[PDB]
Design an enzyme around this catalytic site. Structure first.
Site, mmCIF file in Angstrom:
data_model
loop_
_atom_site.group_PDB
_atom_site.id
_atom_site.type_symbol
_atom_site.label_atom_id
_atom_site.label_comp_id
_atom_site.label_asym_id
_atom_site.label_seq_id
_atom_site.Cartn_x
_atom_site.Cartn_y
_atom_site.Cartn_z
ATOM 1 N N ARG A 126 0.850 -1.178 0.000
ATOM 2 C CA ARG A 126 0.000 0.000 0.000
ATOM 3 C C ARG A 126 0.885 1.226 0.000
ATOM 4 N NH1 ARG A 126 -0.594 3.881 4.477
ATOM 5 N NH2 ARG A 126 -2.024 5.438 3.590
ATOM 6 N N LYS A 174 0.812 5.826 -0.955
ATOM 7 C CA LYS A 174 -0.001 7.030 -0.898
ATOM 8 C C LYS A 174 -1.077 7.048 -1.977
ATOM 9 C CE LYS A 174 1.442 10.464 1.001
ATOM 10 N NZ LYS A 174 2.103 11.631 1.673
ATOM 11 N N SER A 233 -1.884 4.173 -4.225
ATOM 12 C CA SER A 233 -2.232 2.901 -4.849
ATOM 13 C C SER A 233 -2.137 1.806 -3.807
ATOM 14 C CB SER A 233 -1.284 2.593 -6.016
ATOM 15 O OG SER A 233 0.082 2.645 -5.571
ATOM 16 N N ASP A 265 12.156 6.666 -10.216
ATOM 17 C CA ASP A 265 11.980 6.038 -8.931
ATOM 18 C C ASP A 265 12.699 4.697 -8.926
ATOM 19 O OD1 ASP A 265 11.088 5.921 -6.311
ATOM 20 O OD2 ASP A 265 9.089 5.125 -6.877
#
Ligand SMILES: O=C(CCCCCCCNc1nc2cc(C(=O)O)ccc2c2cnccc12)NO
Length: 327
Positions: free
Chosen positions: A42, A44, A46, A151
């Protein structure tokens, strides 16, 4: 200002529809074909579940997107469409919605990954070369497609160490590269942020991802994960400067006309550039070679324009044993 040394104009040479993701109209299929089995993670924006497609019994993952980040959803979807079939890029199987609430989700192939914290402790010299080469294939592919991942970090590089499969996941921060465009520097995990982000230089490019990959290479060959372990963004740059040196930082800032946040005055200090061999000791010596250090030295540079491209990195002698095996 600054421009990428490779693939700089590639999006401007394609149809506008390729990069104009705000105009993209996804085909949304029916999420009811998927049975959620287990929550895997989990964030922020999705949540990811292991799932079964009930029409063909295939195991997949479903990434449910916090709806209404509409522009960002279109961006991730368009990028994944454009990367279709790319080497070692996580395969997008479908774009679906709950047919009642209209909440969107992305369906991906399932990879049985080994968590990197355990994996990195058992990698051999050849394993590191192999996995880094496979990761480089994904980056070279996305850069050639005009996309920066933004990322790159161990959590986003899924490795099935039994089948020897690697996938670069989570394209939710990825963007299209356009020459002279100023981008948001609030990308990447703290430990993998390039100096350009830490000094608020917005005109960055694909070379950001090469910094992050260099950080991963250093962590693997030296068995210090993460390699640069800042306590906040300011301390992150200090940790980098303690290795790369401060005089070298100041030369980078001067070349690009960058002014440092004055809070740095109180914390940066004066640091010589360190020899990479300083990080070798009995626990990592079997993973370090002259070729590994030469490659690392050509990735972890302040000057984003001087870092190797993914292709140049793949061409480095460090990977010759992998190339030889793949032939
Ligand atoms: O560093 C490693 C360990 C990584 C730690 C696991 C993270 C848990 C989340 N788990 C999955 N998150 C995905 C996200 C996306 C996306 O957002 O694009 C796409 C696919 C997956 C995925 C596919 N298969 C199994 C699990 C996951 N090396 O193994």
């Amino acid at each position: 200002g600054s421009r990428a040394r490779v693939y700089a104009e590639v999006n401007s040479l394609r149809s506008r529809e390729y990069w104009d993701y705000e105009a993209h109209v996804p085909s949304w299929g029916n999420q009811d074909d998927y049975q959620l089995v287990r929550k895997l993670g989990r964030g922020k924006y999705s949540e990811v579940f292991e799932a079964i497609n009930i029409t063909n019994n295939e195991r997949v993952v479903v990434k449910i997107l916090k709806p209404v980040k509409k522009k960002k959803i279109k961006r991730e979807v368009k990028i994944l469409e454009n990367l279709r079939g790319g080497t070692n890029i996580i395969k997008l199987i479908d774009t679906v919605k709950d047919p009642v609430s209209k909440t969107p989700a992305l369906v991906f192939e399932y990879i049985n990954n080994t968590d990197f914290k355990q994996l990195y402790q058992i990698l051999t010299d050849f394993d590191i070369r192999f996995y880094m080469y496979e990761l480089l294939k994904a980056l070279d592919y996305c850069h050639s497609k005009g996309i920066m991942h933004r990322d790159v970090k161990p959590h986003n590089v899924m490795i099935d160490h039994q089948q020897k499969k690697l996938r670069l996941i989570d394209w939710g921060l990825a963007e299209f590269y356009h020459p002279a465009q100023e981008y948001n520097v609030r990308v990447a995990s703290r430990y993998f942020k390039g100096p350009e982000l830490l000094v608020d230089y917005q005109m960055y490019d694909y070379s950001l991802d090469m910094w992050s990959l260099g950080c991963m290479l250093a962590s693997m060959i030296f068995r210090r994960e993460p390699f640069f372990h800042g306590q906040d963004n300011y301390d992150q740059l200090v940790r980098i400067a303690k290795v790369l040196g401060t005089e070298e930082l100041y030369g980078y800032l001067k070349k690009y006309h960058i002014d440092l946040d004055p809070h740095f005055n109180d914390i940066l200090g004066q640091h010589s550039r360190k020899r990479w061999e300083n990080f070798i000791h009995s626990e990592n010596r079997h993973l370090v070679s002259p070729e590994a250090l030469d490659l690392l030295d050509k990735l972890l540079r302040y000057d984003h324009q001087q870092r190797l491209t993914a292709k140049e990195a793949m061409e480095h002698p460090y990977f010759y044993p992998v190339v030889k095996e793949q032939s």
